[model samples]
Target: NPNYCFAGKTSSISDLKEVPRKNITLIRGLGHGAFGEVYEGQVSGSPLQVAVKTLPEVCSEQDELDFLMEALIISKFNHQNIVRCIGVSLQSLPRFILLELMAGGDLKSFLRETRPRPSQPSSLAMLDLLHVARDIACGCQYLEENHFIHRDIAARNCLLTCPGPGRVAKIGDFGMARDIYRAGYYRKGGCAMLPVKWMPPEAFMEGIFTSKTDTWSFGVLLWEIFSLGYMPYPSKSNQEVLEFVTSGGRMDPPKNCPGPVYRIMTQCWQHQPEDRPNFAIILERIEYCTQDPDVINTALPIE
Candidate 1:
């Protein structure tokens, strides 16, 4: 199933006219974010439908590089648990990257539809979430083994191919990812200031970014999945999240999560980056917690 292509360097869609045109259909704006507007489209003459991401006209140099890096890294690595990059349009104006479309959309929207506000997901639902968590860890393990760090590991960045039953999770949107412990300088500092709300304390204050920061994002994502899609710090703003983390208030798992699962979540949010578990270790722990048949079938005996 290894089908990855980096086409961020290509030109406009018109330039690709020679390329087949059947499965390919233009889609209006699906959503807008810092990355840019995304369109729901398909590859020409192929049954494979895909998502087309276009960089904004005023995109910064770093933003453009981020997109290119995401395409390049994803194209090189083809994992069943990671979204496949079909092709890149690296010609000139209106560069675009074509990616396989996930029928189930993003974790964010899916969770929203499944749960009402201020509630926690059911045990069965949490088990399903563990599949996603395991898949992300698998993808991150690959990245880290190859000396990379997925800077942005949020719920929205992960995609699900199917819903329940046979649902499979894959990591997407590697725009902010970079090699582990790499050194480079930003205008003021080397690290780019990202969403302070989702950032680890060290990153939010000292401008230090690393694989550990990625773990912090994972902890937040876990909160999103288990808390029925609750955003971190439900009543607080982004600035407040930064302050809270800075003041040593690490995020805690929702009361509904099993104690074991909550302990793992806490481990991921450990204030010291060195104390955090790597993706591989986290993957194994999550598999035991969620994939174990006994764990899935029966609740633990009360102490």
Candidate 2:
């Protein structure tokens, strides 16, 4: 084990753990993002296949800290609906972080491939969608209770344990997460642009982020779910979305979206952050929605 401490008081590597670079062998490229490429790999002593997240040459102090912060944040979580971080490697040139492999890929890709058109046969039933939504809410609820804010929450960031009815949704990609100390809000610098389409009006205008802000994003995520992977506000550009949201515009309910589900979405999109329902409340509502005969029996229209 290669132990390296990045944060917290104790210099113990047992908290996050560490894996030797020699133990992991990259199999193939899975995907690429802002940080770098993620690949499927195998560990020498472990029977389960793993996903390895790697970063190129560290250019600055901030970059290194950001990389370590992601590992640190994920290491603390042990939820069924959240991704698991096995270990990390900071001893080598290109750093490697080990994570549990998600066989069904991301929710976005799953939704898209499974439901190509409105007339196509649905792959996931209405209950499956509700279950996924509930799982995500449970994960976010755990984060809120633990004083961490998931700055990003979307279909793209959610991964599935497998395909079919037994698939379990797990929240992943914590590179942008933050720890809340006093108030829930975290102000960002002016340089970077927020995900305007998914963000609330306050986040776009003032760069303010809170648990409620995440709730707003979760509403957009639910829209994606009900829309069968359709892009949020597809008719508008990012700038247009900003203006539209600031002007009190909101997206209409997706086709075939249950009345109760739409009502929950509307509550999440409330103008004031304080007015938005927390994840716990959202989870309860989703659970209740799952039990509705109209919602469970109604077939979802894939568009």
Candidate 3:
């Protein structure tokens, strides 16, 4: 067995199963991140498909840290709405981190792709988005109960099962999950790139991360769904966003957004973290949309 690195006694926490490297065969490239590239792959001897995350050829300490953190978080969670983790392959240099393949890809890209084309006015029904949001709330609630703080919660951090009239969303891609929304992050001093758009004032101002911070990001994630992946605080610099938010400014609710859903967004952005609803309360608030004439079966105004 390879002696590994984890705190609390050198090479002590080393029992995590290491997947067989030869078992995974890369099918195609999905995307790359700070540490390495993730691919759509298949495991041999089974019909199982996986989103394979491969470590970098030469990973800096922090780069490798992100991979281990993400792998650990996913493997520990068993919620229906949380991404399922397989195992990691540390027998070789470029380790493999296998995750359940979510065919719909990331939610942000799916929402943007549904935007009205030049002529075709096609989009997911509002009910579909509400369902997705509720699923995420369920996952977040699980995290809170488990005493885990996601630190980063966004549409891009979510994976969907398909890109069609119907889909299932799951919360995963833990740790600095910077996806296609590159513009949404701001590079602070050193290697810290923060998603200011989804962060609560306490997070950036005081470096505090709690279940409440995750709730704040969930509100922004909900807004992303209604806006069809549109960027929030458009045309404003990250510094400007920091100033505005710390000073108690919030983006206006999405246009044509249901009145009740918008109220949830506002509540999530409440100035005091303790004043905001926890994940359980937020889930209840969002689930309310499934019952009302005002929100049920509704769709955004066609673009």
Candidate 4:
């Protein structure tokens, strides 16, 4: 029996019923990341399309454990701003995890594909970008309220419900998520490579992770959204980013970033973790920004 215990509960791979392999037909490759290849697929005899994440055949025991943990974690979430898990296939060789097929794919790709050129301006309205940011914050706020820390929060991990102005953003990619049980801080035991550009100063300096650290990453995500998919700190290397951030350096506000939005981002990037506002407060601040009649009525240039 391939049984595992976590959070004082015993679960086996068999606990998650394996869907028939024939039920799914792979359409095309979606994206690749630390886990493995993600492909677009459809369920036979059903109109619903899905995203299938497959585990590599040669994964270590630890990798397999992480995969199972991610599946369990995502399956329990019920939020509009978080990705939905369909099912899993655990008995097969290259096991598959099924998820809802996000029509617009990840936010990173959506921003890159629709970004304005040097001469042209962005077709997306300012409110559209704020909607995306607000949705992501809602998801994080949900996680924080439930005592979970999404260690990795970035635009690349957010998926869009569809393309264009009507799209909804949802936070995905839970492979690095952790449950917070004790104190606010979570200490690391091993040397794991983290996303340096999105990490907080305390995370890099002391291996400490907290909801406040997630707020720091959210600040970077806002920068990513406003900059139209540009990589954060484009000219600096990872080591340099670490050094610079530790020395009080922060990225300048992206061009044309709204005053209220930039102000929220600055609050998230406070030097002291306690100084950073929680997601609940952040959400309230953003809601206020959107409530302003001028902000809602104005469509600023994206260039």
Better of 1 and 2 by TM-score: 2
Cα-based RMSD of the predictions, in order?
6.4, 3.8, 4.7, 3.7
lDDT of 4 by residue, 1-303 (tens): 434444346665566656788788889998677659999988774366889999899887756766776777777777899998888877777888889888898999888887765566557766787899999999999888876678889999999989876798999887566322211233322334568899998888887888999999999999998787889998998989989999999999877777888899989999999999999999999899889877666555444
Per-residue CA lDDT of candidate 2, range 120-226, in tens?
45567788889989999999998888766687789999999887778899998775563222122333333244567789988878878889999999999999888
Model 2, global lDDT: 0.81
TM per model? 0.77, 0.88, 0.87, 0.87
Which regions of candidate 1 deviate over 4 angstroms?
1-23, 27-29, 32-35, 56-67, 116-124, 178-193, 291-303
Between candidates 1 and 2, name the one with more favorable lDDT.
2
Give per-residue CA lDDT, model 3, range 1-303, as digits (tens).
Answer: 223222222231154567777777888998776657889988875467888888886866645555565566567677889988877776777877888888898988888877656576655677888888998999989888876677779888899977776678998676553211111232322223667888998988877778899889988998888787888787677889889988888888786888899899989999999899999899888888777877875657666
- Per-residue CA lDDT of candidate 1, range 1-303, in tens? 112233234232232322233344657656666547678886754355778777776866665655555566666665777888777664544667777777777888777665533345332455676777788778777766765556678888888786656777788776555322122433323333565656787876786877788777777887777665667788887777777888788666664666666777788888899998887888888888885565455432211
- State the displacement of the C-alpha of residue 85, model 3, in Å, after optimal TM-score superposition: 0.8
Instruction: Give, for candidate 3, the lowest lDDT window spanning 10 residues.
Output: 179-188
